[PDB]
C-alpha cells in the first residue's frame, strides 16, 4: 500500500522539464533530413496507412505531448510572441500541420487518446494568430480533396460529451452511503471536458485570424463531393450543452445549496460553454455574411434564450 501511494502521489508531480531541449537537439541538423522531420514523416506515413481503426501508437501519444509542451510591458510581450512563432516554425516547417490533419482524418470520428493528443498538438501549433500554419492546413485540405477530416470533426463534435443528470443522481446516491471509495474520480457526468475544450479551441485557432477563406471552407467545402457544416454542428452542440445546463439548474433549483461536486460540474459546464461561444465568435467575426446567416437561420436563438434564462436564475 505504501508503494502504491508513492507511485500515485510522489513521482508524477511535474518533476522534469525536457521538451524544449529535446525538440531543439532533435531539430539541430548535425549532418539531408532532420531527426524531427524523420519522426514527423514516420507519423504521417502511419496516419496515411489505410486501416479500419486508429491504433494506440504509444510512440505518437508520447511524442505529441512533448511537441505540444515544447511551445510556450511591450518589448517582452513582443519577444515572447516572436519566440512562440519561432518554436511553431521549428516544429511545423517539417510537416506537422499535415500530420495533425491526417491523424484527425484517420480516426473516422472516434474519440480517443490519439485524437486528444493530436488536438493538443494542433492547439500548441496554432497558438495565437499563426496564419502560416492555417494557410498550410488550408492548402493541404484543398490539394487533397477529402471529406474524411471534416466528417471526423463532425462525428467528434456530435459524440464528444454532454452533461447528464442521471449519472450525477446515481453518483449522489452512491456517495450518500458508500464510503468504500468516496468516488474521488468525478467522471461519467462530463466525460471528457478537456477533450471537448481542446477540440473547440482547435477550431477557434483554425478560425483565429479573420480568414474569410477558411471560415467559408468550414461551412461549404467547395470542391468536395459531400459537404458538412461545421458551423451547424457547433451550434447543435451548443444547443445540447445549453439543454444540459438547463436540466442541471432545474435539478439544483430549490435547495439553494451547491456542494463541491455540483460546483465543479457547473464550472466544467461553464468552461465548455465559454469555449463553444469563443469558437462561435471566431467563426462569425469580421463581415462573414455566410456564417452570420448560418447562425441567424438556426436554433442559436433558442439556445441563447435558454442561456439568458439560466443566467438570470443562476445569478
Amino acid at each position: 500500500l505504501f508503494l502504491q501511494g508513492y507511485e500515485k502521489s510522489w513521482i508524477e508531480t511535474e518533476e522534469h522539464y525536457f521538451e524544449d531541449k529535446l525538440i531543439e537537439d532533435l531539430a539541430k541538423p548535425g549532418a539531408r533530413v532532420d531527426p524531427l522531420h524523420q519522426l514527423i514523416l514516420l507519423f504521417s506515413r502511419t496516419a496515411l496507412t489505410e486501416k479500419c481503426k486508429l491504433e494506440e501508437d504509444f510512440l505518437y501519444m508520447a511524442y505529441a505531448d512533448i511537441m505540444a509542451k515544447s511551445c510556450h510591458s511591450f518589448e517582452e510581450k513582443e519577444m515572447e510572441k516572436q519566440k512562440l512563432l519561432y518554436q511553431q516554425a521549428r516544429l511545423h516547417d517539417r510537416g506537422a500541420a499535415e500530420m495533425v490533419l491526417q491523424t484527425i482524418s484517420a480516426s473516422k470520428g472516434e474519440t480517443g487518446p490519439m485524437v486528444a493528443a493530436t488536438l493538443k498538438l494542433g492547439i500548441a501549433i496554432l497558438n495565437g494568430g499563426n496564419s502560416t500554419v492555417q494557410q498550410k492546413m488550408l492548402d493541404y485540405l484543398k490539394e487533397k480533396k477529402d471529406v474524411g477530416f471534416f466528417q471526423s470533426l463532425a462525428g467528434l463534435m456530435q459524440s464528444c460529451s454532454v452533461l447528464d443528470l442521471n449519472a450525477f443522481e446515481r453518483q449522489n446516491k452512491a456517495e450518500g452511503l458508500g464510503m468504500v471509495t468516496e468516488e474521488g474520480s468525478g467522471e461519467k457526468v462530463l466525460q471528457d471536458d478537456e477533450f471537448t475544450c481542446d477540440l473547440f479551441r482547435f477550431l477557434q485557432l483554425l478560425c483565429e485570424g479573420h480568414n474569410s477563406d477558411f471560415q467559408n471552407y468550414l461551412r461549404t467545402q467547395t470542391g468536395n463531393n459531400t459537404t458538412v457544416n461545421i458551423i451547424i454542428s457547433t451550434v447543435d452542440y451548443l444547443l445540447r450543452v445549453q439543454e444540459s445546463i438547463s436540466d442541471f439548474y432545474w435539478y439544483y433549483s430549490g435547495k439553494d445549496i451547491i456542494d463541491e461536486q455540483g460546483q465543479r460540474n457547473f464550472s466544467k459546464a461553464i468552461q465548455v460553454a465559454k469555449q463553444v461561444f469563443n469558437t462561435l465568435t471566431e467563426y462569425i467575426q469580421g463581415p462573414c455574411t455566410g456564417n452570420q446567416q448560418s447562425l441567424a437561420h438556426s436554433r442559436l436563438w433558442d439556445a441563447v434564450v435558454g442561456f439568458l434564462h439560466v443566467f438570470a436564475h443562476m445569478q
Binding site: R45, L48, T49, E50, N225
Partner: protein, 386 residues
C-alpha cells in the same frame, strides 16, 4: 429485405432519389468486369460445346482474344512498385483492393475456376490440339498459365477474397498434381495460406501428405517449403497439429530433403613405391611389410577415429590414385580403386564386410599388423599379431 420497386400511376412523395456520381475508377472497373465476364462466358460455351461431344468448328473460340484479355487483366491487377512515392503507392494499393473487391462481389473467381476446369479436362497440349486445332493446342499452356496467374493476383493482397473462396482448397490441392500448372497452383496456395487464417483450419492431413508427395515427385522446390512454413505458422501463431503432421510426414526417412553430418578429415600417406605387373619384365609379384601403432585414441573429439591400412590402385600407370576428389571421408577401401582393413572389417568400395578372427578388435594401441600382397593369382592379405 427486398422492397421490389413498382412503377405505378399514383406515386408517393417519399421516393427521394439522391445521386452518387459512381467514381470513374469504379465505373471503368465495372465495365472491365462486364467485358471479361462476357468473353469468359463465350469461351466457356465454346469449350463446353467442344468437350461434351464433337461439334461443328463454326463456333466462337477466341483463343488469341482471351489470351490478350488475360495479359491485360494481369497488368490491371499488377501490384504497385515498391520503389515509388509512399502516398501514390498507398493510393494504388487502395485502388487494387477496390478492384479485387468489385471482381469478387460479381462472381469472377468461380468463373475463373470453371475456365480452369474446362481447360484441365484435357491432359496435354497434343491431346488438346487434335480436338481444338493447332493454334489452340499451342496456346493452351499459355492460357492456363495466365489464368492461374490472374487467379493468384485476384487474391494476392486482399483477405476477404481468400476467406470467402477458401472452400476450393480441396479442388486446388487435387489439381496440384496436373504436372503442368504446378507453379501456378502452388503460388495460389501460398498466397491463400499467407493471408487467410481460416484456410489453415480446413487443411487436413491428406492435403499435407499430397503436398509432401508433390515435393517428392517434382523435385527440390523452395516454394513447397515456403508453403509448408506458411502452414506451420500463419500470423504470429502456431498450429501444433500442422507442425506435428509436417514433422511426421516430411522427415521420417530423411530421403525427402538433404541431410547433414559433421565428419572428420582423413589423409592418405604412402611411400614412394609403385607395384605394377605386365608380360615380360615383372617385379616378382610378391611384397610384404609390417605396421605398429604408438598411441591411438578411440574417439578424439566426437566420432570414431578413422584408421585403415591397405593397398590402392591407380589409373593405369599414372599418379592420382582412387578417391572421390580429395579431403573427404574417403580413406582407403572407400572406392573400387582401393582395398583396406581397419581391424574388424574389410573395406572395398565403401562397403565394410565383417570377418572372424581370434580376439577380433579395431586397430588399438600396441597392435602388430602385417600386410602381404601376391599379385597374379591371389590378392592382398592381412595378419594381426601374426
Amino acid at each position: 429485405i427486398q422492397r421490389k420497386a413498382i412503377m405505378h400511376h399514383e406515386g408517393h412523395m417519399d421516393d427521394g432519389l439522391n445521386l452518387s456520381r459512381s467514381q470513374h475508377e469504379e465505373s471503368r472497373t465495372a465495365r472491365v468486369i462486364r467485358s471479361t465476364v462476357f468473353l469468359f462466358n463465350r469461351f466457356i460455351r465454346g469449350l463446353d460445346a467442344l468437350s461434351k461431344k464433337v461439334k461443328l468448328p463454326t463456333i466462337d473460340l477466341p483463343i488469341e482474344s482471351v489470351s490478350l484479355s488475360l495479359q491485360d487483366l494481369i497488368g490491371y491487377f499488377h501490384p504497385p512498385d515498391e520503389h515509388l512515392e509512399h502516398e501514390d503507392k498507398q493510393n494504388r494499393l487502395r485502388a487494387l483492393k477496390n478492384r479485387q473487391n468489385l471482381f469478387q462481389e460479381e462472381g469472377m473467381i468461380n468463373l475463373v475456376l470453371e475456365c480452369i476446369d474446362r481447360l484441365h479436362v484435357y491432359s496435354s497440349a497434343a491431346h488438346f490440339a487434335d480436338v481444338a486445332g493447332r493454334e489452340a493446342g499451342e496456346s493452351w499452356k499459355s492460357i492456363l498459365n495466365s489464368l492461374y496467374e490472374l487467379l493468384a493476383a485476384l487474391i494476392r493482397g486482399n483477405r476477404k477474397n481468400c476467406a470467402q473462396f477458401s472452400g476450393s482448397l480441396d479442388w486446388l490441392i487435387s489439381r496440384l498434381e496436373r504436372l503442368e500448372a504446378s507453379s501456378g497452383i502452388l503460388e495460389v496456395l501460398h498466397c491463400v495460406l499467407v493471408e487467410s487464417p481460416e484456410a489453415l483450419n480446413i487443411i487436413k492431413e491428406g492435403h499435407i501428405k499430397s503436398i509432401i508427395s508433390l515435393l517428392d515427385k517434382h523435385g527440390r522446390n523452395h516454394k513447397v517449403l515456403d508453403v509448408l512454413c506458411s502452414l506451420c505458422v500463419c500470423h504470429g501463431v502456431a498450429v501444433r497439429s500442422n507442425q506435428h503432421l509436417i514433422c511426421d510426414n516430411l522427415l521420417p526417412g530423411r530421403d525427402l530433403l538433404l541431410q547433414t553430418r559433421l565428419v572428420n578429415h582423413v589423409s592418405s600417406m604412402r611411400p614412394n613405391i609403385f607395384l605394377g605387373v605386365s608380360e615380360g619384365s615383372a617385379q616378382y609379384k610378391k611384397w610384404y611389410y609390417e605396421l605398429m601403432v604408438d598411441h591411438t585414441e578411440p574417439f578424439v573429439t566426437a566420432e570414431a577415429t578413422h584408421l585403415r591400412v591397405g593397398w590402392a590402385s591407380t589409373e593405369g600407370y599414372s599418379p592420382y590414385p582412387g578417391g572421390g576428389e580429395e579431403w573427404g571421408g574417403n580413406g582407403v577401401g572407400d572406392d573400387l580403386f582401393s582395398y583396406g582393413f581397419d581391424g574388424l572389417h574389410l573395406w572395398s568400395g565403401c562397403i565394410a564386410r565383417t570377418v572372424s578372427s581370434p580376439n577380433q578388435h579395431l586397430l588399438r594401441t600396441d597392435d602388430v599388423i602385417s600386410c602381404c600382397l601376391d599379385l597374379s593369382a591371389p590378392s592382398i592379405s592381412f595378419r594381426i599379431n601374426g
